[PDB]
């Protein structure tokens, strides 16, 4: 079997991406965020605090002929962001651009905080990381993609994210007109439960390319670029007018500059991040002081391949026995 799915940007800034799923008998279609750092598949649903319901879409089990409480079990899951969620579970059928996986577990909300009620967009996260992640309990379960993974035609899937336009989500099978070049594949380490590989190092603009191991993971559920402090100096050195705001929480540029590219080693290769790119407005409206998209990850303890790198490839998550990740230009 295979699956395909368009990906859509939430607002102009692509904060983040939604991709419709089909939950339940008849089906109930859930705008989720599809995250490759996290393994939980949560949603907005009936048994949600109403106050802290805000436009999104809900999931109601009781509505769904397929859905059965998973009797005792319970998830509670903070993320980077300090955002965070929890509730019950029901195990029901879920669907995904045509492709299906009986008796996933979907992870009621009862509770969400702040970020989610405010984002009337996101209607849950599917998660897509490890399934040693997943934080039920006491039963840990698997994510959509390690339940389809043994019916899929080859043990993969992919992501194509578009900047400022919609993109693709493919299980199963690798679109060969959906990038430009070879497809270079490099090692993954599950240790920690990521799609954690390393990147053999960076170039800003049309400067040298310098080689140096930078460990970090593919994930598509965070916006920016999170890189070690002293390549995201040279970066924004070459931005006149820019800095590091402690006030704001991060670097920040004149929005009347022209951002350099930045590139990313994979082996041998090279991903080429437009500048265009690493621009993500006005700190607050109307202002001249714009957001940068590349980042320090000082402190967060690892560094993040986001959405802002992701977005410039086409990008291979391999879940075969031992899994690897691929990026192509495009």
């Known amino acids: 079997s295979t699956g395909s799915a368009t990906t859509t940007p939430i607002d102009s800034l692509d904060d983040a991406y939604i991709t419709p799923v089909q939950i339940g008998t008849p089906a109930q279609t859930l705008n989720l965020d599809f995250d490759t750092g996290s393994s939980d598949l949560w949603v907005f649903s009936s048994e949600t605090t109403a106050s802290e319901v805000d436009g ?40 995904v651009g045509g492709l299906t996986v009986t008796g996933q577990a979907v992870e009621s909300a009862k509770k969400v905080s702040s970020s989610f009620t405010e984002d009337s967009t996101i209607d849950g996260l599917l998660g897509l990381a490890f399934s040693t992640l997943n934080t039920v309990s006491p039963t840990q379960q698997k994510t959509f993609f390690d339940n389809a993974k043994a019916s899929l035609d080859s043990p ?43 990147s053999t190092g960076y170039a800003v603009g049309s400067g040298t390319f310098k080689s140096t191991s930078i460990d970090g993971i593919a994930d598509t559920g965070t916006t920016l670029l999170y890189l070690p402090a002293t390549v995201v100096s040279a970066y924004w050195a070459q931005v006149s007018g820019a800095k590091s705001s402690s006030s704001v929480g991060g670097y920040v540029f004149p929005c009347s500059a022209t951002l350099p590219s930045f590139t990313f080693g994979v082996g041998s290769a090279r991903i080429v991040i437009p500048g265009d790119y690493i621009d993500f407005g006005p700190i607050s409206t109307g202002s001249s002081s714009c957001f940068g998209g590349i980042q320090s990850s000082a402190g967060i303890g690892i560094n993040i391949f986001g959405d802002v790198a992701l977005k410039a490839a086409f990008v291979v998550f391999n879940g075969a026995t031992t899994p690897t990740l691929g990026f192509a230009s495009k």
């Open 56 to 95: 999104q879409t809900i999931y109601t089990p009781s509505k769904s002929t397929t859905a059965k409480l998973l009797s005792g079990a319970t998830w509670s899951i903070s993320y980077g962001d300090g955002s965070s969620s929890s509730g019950d579970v029901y195990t029901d059928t879920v669907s």
């Open 156 to 198: 993969v899937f992919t992501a194509d994210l578009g900047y400022h336009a919609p993109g693709t989500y493919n299980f199963g099978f690798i679109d060969t007109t959906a990038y430009t070049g070879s497809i270079t594949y490099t090692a993954v380490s599950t240790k920690q439960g990521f799609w954690e590989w390393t």
